[PDB]
Amino acid sequence: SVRLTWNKSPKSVLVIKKMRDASLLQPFKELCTHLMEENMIVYVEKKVLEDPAIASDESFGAVKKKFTSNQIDFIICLGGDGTLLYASSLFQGSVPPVMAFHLGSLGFLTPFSFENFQSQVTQVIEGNAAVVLRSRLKVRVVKEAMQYQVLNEVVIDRGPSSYLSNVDVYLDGHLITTVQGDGVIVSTPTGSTAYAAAAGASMIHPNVPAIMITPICPHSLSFRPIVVPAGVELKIMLSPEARNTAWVSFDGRKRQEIRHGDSISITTSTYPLPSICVRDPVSDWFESLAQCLHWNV
Amino acid sequence: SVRLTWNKSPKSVLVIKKMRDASLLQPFKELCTHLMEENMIVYVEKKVLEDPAIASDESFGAVKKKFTNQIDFIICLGGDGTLLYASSLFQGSVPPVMAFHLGSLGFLTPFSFENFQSQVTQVIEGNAAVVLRSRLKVRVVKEAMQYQVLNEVVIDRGPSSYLSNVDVYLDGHLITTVQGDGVIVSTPTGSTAYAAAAGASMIHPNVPAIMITPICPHSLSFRPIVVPAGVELKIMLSPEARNTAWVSFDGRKRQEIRHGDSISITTSTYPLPSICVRDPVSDWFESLAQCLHWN
Amino acid sequence: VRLTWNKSPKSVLVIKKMRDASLLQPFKELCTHLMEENMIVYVEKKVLEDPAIASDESFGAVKKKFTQIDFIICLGGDGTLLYASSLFQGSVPPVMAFHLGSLGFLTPFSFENFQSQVTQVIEGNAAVVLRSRLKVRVVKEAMQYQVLNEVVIDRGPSSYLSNVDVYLDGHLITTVQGDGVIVSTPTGSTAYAAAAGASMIHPNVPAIMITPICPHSLSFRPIVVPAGVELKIMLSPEARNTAWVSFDGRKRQEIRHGDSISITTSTYPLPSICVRDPVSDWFESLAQCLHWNV
Amino acid sequence: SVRLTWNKSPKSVLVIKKMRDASLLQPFKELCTHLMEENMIVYVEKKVLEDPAIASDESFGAVKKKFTQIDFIICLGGDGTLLYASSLFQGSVPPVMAFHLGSLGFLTPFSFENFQSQVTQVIEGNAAVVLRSRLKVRVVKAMQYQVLNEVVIDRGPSSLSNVDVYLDGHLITTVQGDGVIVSTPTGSTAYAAAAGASMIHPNVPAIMITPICPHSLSFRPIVVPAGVELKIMLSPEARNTAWVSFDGRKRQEIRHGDSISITTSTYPLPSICVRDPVSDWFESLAQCLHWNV
């Protein structure tokens, strides 16, 4: 039940929109006006302020000139479960608190509703609103060097190919299983409702410190989606007696092939992602399950 | 349980080897010598009799010369892939197929290689039980190309990313729109194939039905369904989708399907008969036990 | 599918779900219309004795005209058609099931404009689904049953694992260990069998399902076998305690070491009339009731 | 990485046997003689030393008199003995070492071969342990229970079940079906696994909620933070009694006014690992339930 900690009053706001959506153009204008109305410096993505849709409207040009890594104090995200992934990408270090709004479809990371947004934003800036310290994974891909921070899942699966994958999974140098099938969806508790859920994984509340291992259509019918303690060091590498190679993805981002020499190491990060909740960590998660994924209906 | 009907005594044998396996050389040589001992014409794949392993061994050159709608009986070597190749090579009325498992045992390879001469003589002379395995007549129409599929036809997100939105029409009615990795519409014989890894139930090959199984569906309440055999399926991309989908036929040629393309699936009239070592039922459960660890 | 009455229908057997006030008034409207035509109406003798139906003197006018079955009309959801099969161990006549409120897998017909729908079934030809049933025979150290949805062998007033052997043509296939088994017809694939992880089978597939209840082994999945097979389930000799058998949520009887149960597809199917077609009715039922898509 | 802290050298040992097995009769004699050989008091259940098998054998009568606050627990049997060990210790339970004579379970890491050398290491040296979580359960009609594997609320001698589940005062779900199998991470490999639950390592501090054959096709097992307050009670509608079981112990009947509350206990069960907590758990998966062939 961590409430909040500002230390110094907020002054920098990084507003990130899902883009490529006309429906989000108009609500973006209203929020920026109110945020700019208060004595708060507003950061917006560099590419966002130069789209033809935002450039054509000369009415909004009044505040466009007042826009502007390590000085962001608070993040506002527009969009459902596709924007918070991008927010974590720009912050490999300590990411500030993130408040996500759902305009239409409601996701697992977007509790706040857009109606009466002025009152909700003022409460976060002035008052205290409860947060969930969501866990993240740091993955290192060693080539025979390149870290990543992953919020939902890292997937090691067969890319363009036909043969079943044969990749070995190590847990603290104590090789546990060799998964044969499409792949594995090693994931955080936040990703338990993500693509990992489609593979038969159980749904973990984001306050449970753990790392999940879930196959994608395993060949063995007794292979279950285990979950391991948070502080363990994983290591996934191709088995030496295995034809064809495998591809790795990071929250639906850059895909790079791993061969008989490359190894990926997974460990829980020390820089969590705080997401603000509208009511409380427990009720919002269960409300999200029913409204989005139909947990009980 | 239909046994056998030769009409005329067998004279042509088509032997397919799994290939790319040195362990299959000597048993193949022994079987070919035994078959050539009898007055039976032996057909072997043309590109099989040109490998460096089969060319270097000059001892086998004594019988190498005697090789060669004209096949009466099929002998298969390999596990669960050789019968796929045989079905691919025979788009019409495929003759009876007998499969031998040399090491690993599959769902389509009941016969053991020990005392192979006696088993082959019994199959040729006597009557042995068969399973008339069903196949699918998939037709892909472009904005023209039929295939016969024994295990499964898969429509999934191929060399690309992002979710999939493809519509499934059954007898002209949109039954469902599957979102996820894809769908594994398959025969009962494929119920133990990759369709099984996606959560499908295990259907005995004497059940006349067609299965529909998703690959990691987005909705938690979307269970595999099985539909009557004599149904006409039709899978095509949803109009409100951007990324195209890729279709595979038993792990064979993959072709991307765009908005204007549709695939139609219907039970074939040319089944694949596979001879059983003991009976059509017990062999399936034995294969489930050892091959797949059913319990 | 090409329904022929041979002789025009004259006997109608109406079964109500009972213990439901909401079904009292709709029952009155249908019986008046059915009695309006020159058609003998059969109703269960215990139906016309409830205080609710006796108190209303207005309906007493046609109560006397109630009373070899040619056609069956059912009211209720997924619980009435099971009772309809119970009274007919032989050739059950076609059954038309109405849903008032909740919609089930056995009840396609909507109660609105029931007069037009009933007249079409009586006069015109409608489409039917020949639902498969199981001839279950229990032999002690003989009681024969007909089961439409499922026969379940599981622990009852006790709490321990189960070790029961499943024989298939004398070639015992597995010893299921866990809660039990839900051997069932395709019509029961949208029932308690489905709650155990069974795939949903269209009722035109002629096969028999075997679905465990919480099996102890992780790699043990529901199987479906050809319809014409003879199943035989009996307790394993090296197993303590006993198991209990249920027939569509009906009488339970304990089976001990010497008792065996034999299951075989019946030769007397249950014809259920569909509103549009055998296929699209089933898929609509999946979405509206079991949420197969959402 | 805490391993063990005896503080005071062990002097009291409670040896509990799975019983009802002739194969376990002989190994029981060997261990008790060796444990009594060292200057260490041995406790045995009072009903154990009265069976015809133990009374008839006059050879073992030499030390039968010397049997008699427990400092260390030795268990014989597979996955059925530590449940009995938890029952006798509702407070702080001492370290528990379990031997698998034949069948290999999840709470029984130690093998009986070269037992004497293994016993000396535990008494003298330090061995790694798993602080397994337990659930304190209150049934209010205030009879508490401590549960190691699972508490099950399911239909019993009857024929669906409509029972409500509350989490910190909020109705999270209403489960319809056979019932709910709320369990600890140690119970994830127990009958909770047969219900479709994922397999949780016993070092993950969480509480699992899993249905038993739920009516809805989409009702996935959920796992919640350890320090949360569960409260399960019958729905006001669908008046039919449900039954509650605690690791297969006394099955009670819950009516409309009965409530069951589940929270993580503050008295864990320390089970001694054989080589290390991580590798031992994966070894048990391969042999017991054949996880990935």
CB A101 within 8 A of CB A113: yes
Residue D35 sits in the same domain as residue D95: yes
Tell me if chain A has a CB within 8 Å of the CB of C221.
Answer: yes
Distance of alpha carbon C258 from alpha carbon D44, whole angstroms: 40
Residue C1 within a domain: no
Any catalytic annotation for residue B171? no
Which amino acid, B219? S
CB D258 within 8 A of CB D141: yes
Nearest Cα to Cα of residue D270 among D85, D35, D45, D117: D85
Please name the residues in contact with C95: beta carbons below 8 A apart, sequence gap of 6 or more.
Answer: C72, C73, C74, C81, C84, C270, C271, C272, C273
Distance of alpha carbon A7 from alpha carbon A9, whole angstroms: 7
Tell me if chain C has a CB within 8 Å of the CB of B206.
Answer: yes
Distance of alpha carbon C205 from alpha carbon D31, whole angstroms: 61
Please name the residues in contact with D258: beta carbons below 8 A apart, sequence gap of 6 or more.
Answer: D139, D140, D141, D233, D234
**Phi–psi pair at C123, nearest 5 degrees:** -90, -60
Over the Cα atoms of chain A, what is R_g?
A: 21
Q: Which two tokens stand for residue B29?
A: 């040589």
Instruction: Spell out a b/e string for B43-59, using b for 16 or more CB atoms within 10 Å of the CB, else e.
Output: bbeeeeeeeeebeeeee
Residue B230 sits in the same domain as residue B191: yes
Residue D5 within a domain: no
Q: Which two tokens stand for residue B84?
A: 């796929």
Beta strands D72-76 and D12-17 are: parallel
User: With an 8 Å Cβ cutoff, are C195 and D218 in contact?
Assistant: no
Q: Which two tokens stand for residue A164?
A: 């079943």
Please name the residues in contact with D223: beta carbons below 8 A apart, sequence gap of 6 or more.
Answer: A202, A203, A204, A205, A208, A227, D198, D200, D206, D207, D208, D209
Angstrom distances, CA of residue C294 to CA of B54, C287, D3:
58, 7, 50
Residue D125 sits in the same domain as residue D205: no
Please name the residues in contact with D270: beta carbons below 8 A apart, sequence gap of 6 or more.
Answer: D93, D94, D95, D96, D129, D130, D131, D132
CB A68 within 8 A of CB A43: yes
Mutation for testing the B interface, residue in D213, D215, D218, D292 having most B CBs under 10 Å = D218
Which string of DSSP letters, residue by residue, matches C224-237? EEETT-EEEEEE-S
The active-site residue out of B57, B72, B80, B279 is B80
Residue C277 within a domain: yes
Distance of alpha carbon A10 from alpha carbon A141, whole angstroms: 36
* CB-count burial class (<10 Å; 0-12, 13-18, 19+) for B146: exposed
List residues in chain A that are followed by a break over 2.5 Å (C to N).
68, 144
Residue A254 sits in the same domain as residue A154: yes
User: With an 8 Å Cβ cutoff, are C201 and B170 in contact?
Assistant: no
* CB-count burial class (<10 Å; 0-12, 13-18, 19+) for D116: exposed
Residue B126 sits in the same domain as residue B144: no
Share of chain C residues as helix, strand and coil, in percent rounded to the nearest 5: 20, 30, 45
Task: Count Cβ atoms below 10 Å from residue C235 Cβ, excluding itself.
Answer: 22
Residue C138 sits in the same domain as residue C261: yes
Beta strands D135-140 and D143-147 are: antiparallel
Which string of DSSP letters, residue by residue, matches chain D? ------SS---EEEEEE--S-GGGHHHHHHHHHHHHHSS-EEEE-TTGGGSHHHHH-STTHHHHTT-----EEEEESSSSSHHHHHHH-SS-PPPEEEE-SSS--SS--B-STTHHHHHHHHHHS---EEEE--EEEEEE--EEEEESSBEEEE--S---EEEEEEETTEEEEEEEEEEE--B-SGGGGTHHHHTT---B-TTS-EEEE-EEEESSS----EEEETT--EEEEE-SSS---EEEEETT-PPEEE-TT-EEEEEE-SS-EEEE-SS-HHHHHHHHHHHHS-TT-
H or E element that contains B203: strand B202-203
Residue C113 sits in the same domain as residue C35: yes
Angle (nearest 5°) at CA B62 between B58 and B65: 105
Torsion of CA B210, B216, B217, B221, to 10 degrees: 90
Give the domain CATH number at B169. 2.60.200.30
Task: Count Cβ atoms below 10 Å from residue C200 Cβ, excluding itself.
Answer: 22
Closest Cβ opposite residue C294 in set A221, A222, A294: A294
Chain D residue with Cα closest to A293 = D218
Which amino acid, C42? Y
What is the number of structural domains in chain C?
Answer: 2
Residue B258 within a domain: yes
A-B contacts (CB, under 8 Å): 44
CB A94 within 8 A of CB A271: yes
Instruction: Say how many residues make up chain A.
Output: 297
Residues of chain C with C-beta less than 8 angstroms from the C-beta of A297? 291, 294
CB C109 within 8 A of CB C100: no
Give the domain CATH number at D21. 3.40.50.10330
Please name the residues in contact with C73: beta carbons below 8 A apart, sequence gap of 6 or more.
Answer: C12, C13, C14, C15, C30, C34, C95, C96, C97, C98, C118
**Phi–psi pair at C199, nearest 5 degrees:** -70, 150
CB D214 within 8 A of CB D195: no
Tell me if chain A has a CB within 8 Å of the CB of B248.
Answer: yes
Residue A98 sits in the same domain as residue A152: no
Please name the residues in contact with C182: beta carbons below 8 A apart, sequence gap of 6 or more.
Answer: C150, C152, C188, C192, C193, C196, C198, C209, C210, C211, C212, C213
Residue C71 within a domain: yes
Which residue segment(s) compose the domain that D222 sits in?
A: 135-264
CB C219 within 8 A of CB C182: no
Residue C236 within a domain: yes
Q: CA D189, D192, D197, D203 torsion: positive or negative? A: negative
CB B60 within 8 A of CB B36: no
Angle (nearest 5°) at CA C219 between D197 and B184: 95
Q: CA C28, C30, C33, C36 torsion: positive or negative? A: negative
Task: Count Cβ atoms below 10 Å from residue D277 Cβ, excluding itself.
Answer: 20
Beta strands A131-134 and A273-276 are: antiparallel
Please name the residues in contact with A234: beta carbons below 8 A apart, sequence gap of 6 or more.
Answer: A169, A170, A171, A186, A211, A213, A228, A265, A266, A267
**Phi–psi pair at A77, nearest 5 degrees:** -120, 135
Torsion of CA C33, C34, C35, C38, to 10 degrees: 120
Q: Which residues pair with D130 in a beta bridge?
A: D271
Q: Residue ranges of the alpha helices (H) in chain C?
A: 24-36, 51-55, 60-63, 80-87, 114-123, 280-285
Residue A110 sits in the same domain as residue A30: yes
The active-site residue out of D71, D79, D154, D280 is D79
Nearest Cα to Cα of residue A177 among D290, D128, B196: D290
Distance of alpha carbon A281 from alpha carbon A208, whole angstroms: 12
Residue D55 sits in the same domain as residue D94: yes
Over the Cα atoms of chain D, what is R_g?
A: 21
Closest Cβ opposite residue C218 in set A222, A294, A297: A222
Beta strands A12-17 and A74-78 are: parallel
Q: Which two tokens stand for residue C236?
A: 């394993």
Q: Which residues pair with C247 in a beta bridge?
A: C151
Instruction: Spell out a b/e string for A158-182, using b for 16 or more CB atoms within 10 Å of the CB, else e.
Output: bbebeebbbbbbbbeeeebbebbbb
Which amino acid, D203? N
Q: What is the DSSP secondary structure assignment for residue C184, as one 8-state letter?
A: B
**Phi–psi pair at A233, nearest 5 degrees:** -105, 110
Tell me if chain C has a CB within 8 Å of the CB of D194.
Answer: yes
Residue C40 sits in the same domain as residue C86: yes
CB A51 within 8 A of CB A62: no
Distance of alpha carbon B57 from alpha carbon B64, whole angstroms: 10
How far is it between the farthest Cα atoms of chain C? Answer: 64
Please name the residues in contact with C226: beta carbons below 8 A apart, sequence gap of 6 or more.
Answer: B204, B206, B207, C206, C207, C208
Tell me if chain B has a CB within 8 Å of the CB of C290.
Answer: yes
What SS3 state is found at B190?
Answer: helix
Q: Which two tokens stand for residue C103?
A: 């919609």
Which string of DSSP letters, residue by residue, matches C273-289? EESS-TTHHHHHHIIII
User: With an 8 Å Cβ cutoff, are A203 and D218 in contact?
Assistant: no
End-to-end Cα, chain A, rounded Å: 29
Residue A249 sits in the same domain as residue A280: no
Tell me if chain B has a CB within 8 Å of the CB of C220.
Answer: yes
Q: CA C103, C107, C111, C116 torsion: positive or negative? A: positive
What SS3 state is found at B194?
Answer: helix
CB B275 within 8 A of CB B129: yes
Which amino acid, B32? C
Residue A285 within a domain: yes
Tell me if chain A has a CB within 8 Å of the CB of D217.
Answer: no
Long-range contacts of A83-86 (CB under 8 A, 24+ apart): A83/A16, A83/A17, A83/A18, A84/A109, A84/A110, A84/A151, A84/A273, A84/A275, A85/A151, A85/A152, A85/A251, A85/A252, A86/A16
H or E element that contains B30: helix B25-37
Task: Count Cβ atoms below 10 Å from residue C270 Cβ, excluding itself.
Answer: 28
Which string of DSSP letters, residue by residue, matches chain A? ------SS---EEEEEE--S-GGGHHHHHHHHHHHHHTT-EEEE-TTGGGSHHHHH-STTHHHHTT-------EEEEESSSSSHHHHHHH-SS-PPPEEEEESSS--SS--EESTTHHHHHHHHHHS---EEEE--EEEEEE----EEEESSBEEEE--S--SPEEEEEEESS---EEEEEEEE--B-GGGGGTTTGGGT--EE-TTS-EEE--EEEESSTT----EEETT--EEEEE-SS--S-EEEEESS---EEE-TT-EEEEEE-SS-EEEE-SS-HHHHHHHHIIIII-S--
Q: Which residues pair with D136 in a beta bridge?
A: D146, D263
**Phi–psi pair at D42, nearest 5 degrees:** -115, 130
Residues of chain B with C-beta less than 8 angstroms from the C-beta of C171? 279, 281-282, 285
Residue A75 within a domain: yes
Closest Cα in chain D, distance from residue A92 (Å): 26
Distance of alpha carbon B225 from alpha carbon C194, whole angstroms: 11
Q: CA B98, B104, B108, B114 torsion: positive or negative? A: positive
Nearest Cα to Cα of residue B234 among B194, B183, B285: B183
Q: Which two tokens stand for residue D265?
A: 């206990």
Mutation for testing the D interface, residue in C214, C252, C254, C291 having most D CBs under 10 Å = C214
Task: Count Cβ atoms below 10 Å from residue C43 Cβ, excluding itself.
Answer: 18
Distance of alpha carbon A45 from alpha carbon A53, whole angstroms: 15
Nearest Cα to Cα of residue A251 among A87, A119, A93, A103: A87
Q: Which two tokens stand for residue D68?
A: 């008699």
End-to-end Cα, chain B, rounded Å: 27
User: With an 8 Å Cβ cutoff, are C219 and A221 in contact?
Assistant: yes
